[PDB]
């Protein structure tokens, strides 16, 4: 007699993080799967996210955890896609400014969590990085990527 174990369906966090950072229901599981084909379930890697943004003329810059957060020119960034641990297991999370207020748009939240201005989200990132196992991706336009104007 083996062990019966029902599991939850995947969270699709990569799709929700893409859509939340763009403030629009643009991507789906079908779009993610289609992208994952040409690069060779529901646990999409950072290659899929990069390719998804690239198809829209955008780009994901990988933030060097060694740099001080003061060197991050947040106003030049469309939004942030984080990779945080989930008590291993990891999940993707979007951080995004709307009308000057930054929000933690974690798809596991019931409502967006307001972080405040650049200082507030900078403290959030510093607290997320100090916890360990946190990767910060910058969602920027192709122009901002070429110029490196995400780096202050």
């Amino acid at each position: 007699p083996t062990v019966y174990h029902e599991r939850q369906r995947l969270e699709l966090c990569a799709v929700h993080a893409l859509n939340n950072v763009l403030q629009q229901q643009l991507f789906s599981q079908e779009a993610a799967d289609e992208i994952c084909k040409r690069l060779a379930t529901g646990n999409y890697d950072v290659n899929v996210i990069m390719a998804a943004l690239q198809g829209l003329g955008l780009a994901a810059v990988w933030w060097d955890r060694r740099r001080p957060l003061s060197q991050l020119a947040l106003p030049q960034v469309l939004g942030l896609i984080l990779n945080l641990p989930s008590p291993r297991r990891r999940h993707w999370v979007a951080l995004r400014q709307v009308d000057g207020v930054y929000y933690n748009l974690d798809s596991k939240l019931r409502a967006p969590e307001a972080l405040g201005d650049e200082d507030g989200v900078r403290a959030f990132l510093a607290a997320a990085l100090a916890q360990g196992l946190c990767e910060v991706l910058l969602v920027v336009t192709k122009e901002v990527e070429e110029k490196g104007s995400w780096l202050r």
């Binding site: 890697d45 950072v46 290659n47 990069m50 690239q54 990779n83 990891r90 990767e135």
Partner: protein, 75 residues
């Protein structure tokens, strides 16, 4: 000498290296330019994945060679 690192997004990274540089040193130089941590990098040359502790000369990776970069981060 110069070697090229090609990513899945079509980007090409140019690096200055020595034959005695380890693959970890190459990943460290990729981190300096791209911010990608070494433990998230998978470097492949001629269809084989490269080992961190080995050197560039061990794999006969010469000047102007083209390495491929695959990222591991999943979520």
């Amino acid at each position: 000498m110069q070697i090229f690192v090609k990513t899945l997004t079509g980007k090409t990274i140019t690096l200055e290296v020595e034959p005695s540089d380890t693959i970890e040193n190459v990943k460290a130089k990729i981190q300096d330019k791209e911010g990608i941590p070494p433990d998230q990098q998978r470097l492949i040359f001629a269809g084989k994945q490269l080992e961190d502790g080995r050197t560039l000369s061990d794999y006969n990776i010469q000047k102007e060679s083209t390495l491929h970069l695959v990222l591991r981060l999943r979520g």
